Ligand binder design. Structure first.
Ligand SMILES: OC[C@H]1O[C@@](CO)(O[C@H]2O[C@H](CO)[C@@H](O)[C@H](O)[C@H]2O)[C@@H](O)[C@@H]1O
Length: 464
């Protein structure tokens, strides 16, 4: 590693840290120490700790020359910052995965380099290694994988896993302005054999397929990815770009992904894009970037942008991936703020953090009004039984979906200094939206019915 380049960045961060307005900084969501965060990267388990990286531009609250930020956790709730894992050189350090080989945590990441031809960039897969889980050195012979079908300039966001005697990777690409994902495999992590175009847009599924993922859940293969170029369709695909999944079966003989290509959005909120998953304890954990491309970031002017979501546990119930907060998220709970009846127009007061478990009768309207103690911008969460929809109105911008409850009719709502995550029922309908208002959260019952509300303040689990 370049000791000069590193030390200079560590001291830029340690100094720039004092200029970070804390007003919107999350208490219990992963945020960059300073500057810009986008897609989470290389979700891994190495030496008794979950490791997570992320697309990181230290020097400003907007996108720029891509670094890998780095955090670790015992419980997937509390996270410590580590030194910047990857600093760009000739290549920007674009998204990718991480896997444990020997004593080593191995990062497989896309290196984007400039060119002087129409695309004006090229994408290949770079290796970096660590034995201490702190310092990362790039492989002398990078890139280890350069071949992409139709010589497409788009070739990014490898998700690597081990099955039998091979590492497999799914990688995002385009061709004739159609999104696609490519399956490769290696015996040694250095030499990569192309297997198949796992899926491709027929025209209606966008021009680029970012942050692909592939894993088993509920006895099925999930292809989870971030397509760009979907048209809004009724209530769906309203965000700048989408994250969603196909259900099917990956055949490890034919390397064919057999699916009906029934697309579903994972998260119905305003600010959900680009996911990572890991499997352990017989569970499937997922985390996403808690922002959206080409829309205002109200925290930008405070010298930072972006958080992750809460880590969610996945299940496949029928045809639906449910998301729920971690079983032990209740460890965040400090003060018990409310229990039982919350009458019409009655309000609950928090600090910057809130957990609310609410139930009403689904025969009548449910509505929460969420706003700062000192007023400012409003977010409303509504059950409208006329249309059978959950509606998150974030400062006038609507996200809504039909909700057919699996079982539980209760909602679990998590507020952080500048975020909202609504888990409806058993997690079949989830909204993740960034929210901003003036001061400590006040939540008012706007419903024409009394709600049952269990409410807590939540402690910090991440740095300022
Ligand atoms: O930081 C690059 C990293 O982010 C992803 C997913 O968000 O792609 C981004 O890259 C470009 C940044 O301007 C955009 O063209 C693209 O739309 C944006 O999503 C990953 O694909 C990539 O590794």
């Amino acid at each position: 590693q370049n000791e000069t380049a590193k030390r200079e960045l560590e001291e830029y961060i340690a100094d720039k840290k004092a200029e970070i307005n804390p007003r919107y900084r999350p208490h219990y969501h992963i945020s960059p120490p300073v500057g810009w965060m986008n897609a989470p990267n290389g979700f891994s388990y190495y030496k008794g700790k979950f490791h997570l990286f992320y697309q990181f531009y230290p020097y400003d609250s907007v996108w720029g020359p891509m670094h890998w930020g780095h955090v670790s956790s015992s419980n997937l709730i509390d996270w410590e910052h580590l030194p910047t894992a990857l600093i760009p050189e000739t290549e920007m350090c674009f998204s990718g995965g991480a896997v444990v080989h020997g004593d080593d945590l191995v990062l497989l990441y896309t290196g984007r380099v400039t060119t002087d031809t129409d695309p004006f960039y090229n994408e290949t897969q770079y290796l970096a290694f660590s034995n201490d889980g702190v310092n990362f050195r790039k492989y002398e012979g990078n890139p280890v994988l350069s071949y992409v079908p139709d010589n497409s300039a788009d070739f990014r966001d490898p998700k690597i896993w081990k099955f039998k005697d091979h590492w497999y990777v799914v990688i995002g690409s385009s061709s004739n302005k159609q999104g696609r994902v490519l399956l490769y495999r290696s015996g040694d992590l250095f030499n990569w054999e192309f297997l198949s175009v796992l899926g491709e847009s027929d025209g209606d599924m966008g021009y680029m397929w970012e942050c692909p993922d592939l894993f088993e859940l509920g006895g099925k293969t999930i292809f989870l990815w971030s397509p760009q170029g979907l048209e809004p369709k009724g209530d769906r695909y309203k965000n700048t770009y989408q994250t969603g999944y196909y259900i099917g079966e990956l055949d490890y003989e034919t390397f064919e992904f057999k699916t009906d290509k029934y697309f579903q959005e994972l998260d119905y909120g305003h600010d959900f894009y680009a996911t990572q998953t890991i499997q352990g304890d017989g569970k499937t954990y997922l985390i996403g970037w808690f922002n959206m491309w080409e829309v205002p970031h109200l925290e930008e002017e405070d010298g930072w942008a972006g958080t992750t979501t809460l880590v969610r546990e996945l299940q496949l119930i029928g045809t639906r991936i449910t998301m729920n907060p971690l079983e032990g998220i209740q460890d965040l709970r400090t003060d018990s703020v409310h229990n039982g009846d919350l009458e019409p127009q009655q309000a609950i007061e928090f600090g910057p953090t809130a957990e609310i478990i609410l139930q009403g009768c689904l025969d009548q309207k449910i509505e929460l009004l969420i706003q700062g103690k000192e007023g400012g911008l409003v977010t409303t969460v509504t059950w409208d039984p006329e249309v059978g929809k959950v509606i998150v109105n974030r400062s006038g911008e609507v996200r809504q979906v039909e909700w057919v409850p699996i079982g539980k009719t209760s909602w679990r709502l998590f507020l952080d200094a500048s975020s909202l995550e609504l888990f409806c029922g058993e997690g079949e309908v989830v909204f993740s939206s960034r929210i901003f208002s003036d001061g400590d959260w006040v939540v008012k019952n706007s419903s024409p019915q009394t709600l049952s509300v269990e409410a807590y303040r939540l402690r910090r689990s991440v740095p300022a």
